[PDB]
């Protein structure tokens, strides 16, 4: 039961790291998201012109 | 007469004949690239052209593809 306890807890370590990692992925993707909005302004007008 | 439905079909036939737009170039493009003695290629092209001239009794498909059908 004690080995099972350490192992459940080992799996929890691994997952809290995977929790932080995807959270960094989101922090990164935020920059891209901001930049995209200013950029889409230019594209809309061109496609309507054609 | 109306409820029998045969008039409504007649009205639709007049429409399909006149206002049809079709690719006369497709028939020749299909012909060269896909062979008729390769059976699989024939099957696709026969079903493809028929859909194209659907709705209107046409002999356009026979005359374009006169030798191709007999293979």
């Amino acid at each position: 039961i004690n080995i099972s306890n350490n192992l459940q807890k080992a799996l929890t370590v691994k997952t809290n790291d995977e929790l932080m990692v995807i959270y960094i992925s989101n922090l990164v993707r935020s920059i891209i998201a901001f930049d995209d909005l200013i950029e889409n302004k230019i594209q809309n007008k061109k496609i309507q012109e054609q | 007469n109306i409820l029998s439905g045969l008039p409504t079909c007649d009205y639709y036939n007049t429409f399909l004949l006149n206002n049809k737009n079709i690719d006369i170039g497709l028939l020749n493009k299909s012909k060269s690239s896909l062979d008729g003695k390769f059976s699989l290629f024939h099957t696709a092209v026969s079903v493809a052209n028929g859909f194209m001239h659907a709705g209107t009794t046409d002999n356009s498909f026979i005359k374009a593809n006169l030798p191709w059908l007999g293979k």
């Binding site: 039961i1 080995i3 099972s4 350490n6 192992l7 459940q8 080992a10 799996l11 691994k14 790291d17 995977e18 | 003695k37 390769f38 059976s39 699989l40 290629f41 099957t43």
Partner: protein, 289 residues
């Protein structure tokens, strides 16, 4: 028109499939062969019910190795038991080579093709059955006249079908200039299924049954000891994870195979195993006494 053929798919029953394997493994390296007893229905289903094995020759597989004399004798023995029907071809077994018919096998086949036009030649590979998939393929001669008129397309139409391969090389050469290969489905009824599934007397004698606790102490000790080592690589590793490009980090500081994934797998396997080990342990103590 003449007479116009289309696709067929050869349905090899459960009984026949094992029988072919049994015979082919045993006589190898020598080429082994045998006749197919079956019935032909539809225009798309060749039903191969049973096979049997013909005596082998040191002169391999050939026109004169089949033996029609032993066939006539074998036929009567099937006759009295209701297990005769009508012969639908032949099989032979190549060993390390692909599924394809040799020049000698064309001439063997041509004699079968006259007698019944719906004769198949079925190549078994037994030295290539060491995989989890048994490579088996079937062929059927297309007539010399037919190829000039390019009637191989004729056989392909009327379904998309699988158009499965499992071998090329020599196979595709031979295909051009002789035969048309047939895809394989296997038949089995809802009785045959249960027999197949059941391979244990450990259906009810495997949950209360267990391995000594010595062996469970070994699994526990190995498992805990190793996870330290995966944990020390993961510690060197995650001093990084803050530089440029994932792909670089993996090479240089050995992110390869993912040590994060490797520790999760090693923990998951022993974690699930011990719940079972206790679960069976306590079940016995409480129910038995």
């Amino acid at each position: 028109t003449g007479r116009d053929d289309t696709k067929e798919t050869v349905y090899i029953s459960s009984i026949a499939l094992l029988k072919m394997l049994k015979h082919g493994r045993a006589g190898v390296p020598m080429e082994v062969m045998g006749l197919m007893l079956g019935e032909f229905v539809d225009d798309y289903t060749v039903n191969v019910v049973d096979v049997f094995a013909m005596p082998q020759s040191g002169t391999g597989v050939s026109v004169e190795a089949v033996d029609d004399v032993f066939q006539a004798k074998m036929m009567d023995m099937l006759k009295q038991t209701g297990r005769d029907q009508m012969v639908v071809g032949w099989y032979h077994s190549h060993p390390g080579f692909g599924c394809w018919l040799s020049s000698v096998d064309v001439n063997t086949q041509k004699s079968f093709e006259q007698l019944n036009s719906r004769a198949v030649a079925v190549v078994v590979d037994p030295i290539q059955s060491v995989k989890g998939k048994v490579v088996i393929d079937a062929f059927r001669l297309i007539d010399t006249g037919a190829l000039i008129n390019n009637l191989e397309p004729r056989q392909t139409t009327s379904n998309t079908g699988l158009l499965n391969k499992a071998n090329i090389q020599a196979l595709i050469h031979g295909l051009n200039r002789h035969y048309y290969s047939l895809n394989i489905d296997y038949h089995k009824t809802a009785k045959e299924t249960k027999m197949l599934m059941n391979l244990h007397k450990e259906q009810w004698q495997s949950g209360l049954k267990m391995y000594d606790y010595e062996e469970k102490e070994e699994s526990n000790l190995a498992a805990t000891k190793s996870m330290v080592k995966i944990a020390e690589q993961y510690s060197k590793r995650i001093e990084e994870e803050k530089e440029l490009t994932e792909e670089e980090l993996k090479t240089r500081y050995v992110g390869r195979q993912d040590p994060k994934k490797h520790l999760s797998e090693t923990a998951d396997e022993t974690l699930e195993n011990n719940i079972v080990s206790v679960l069976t342990a306590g079940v016995n103590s409480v129910a038995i006494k």
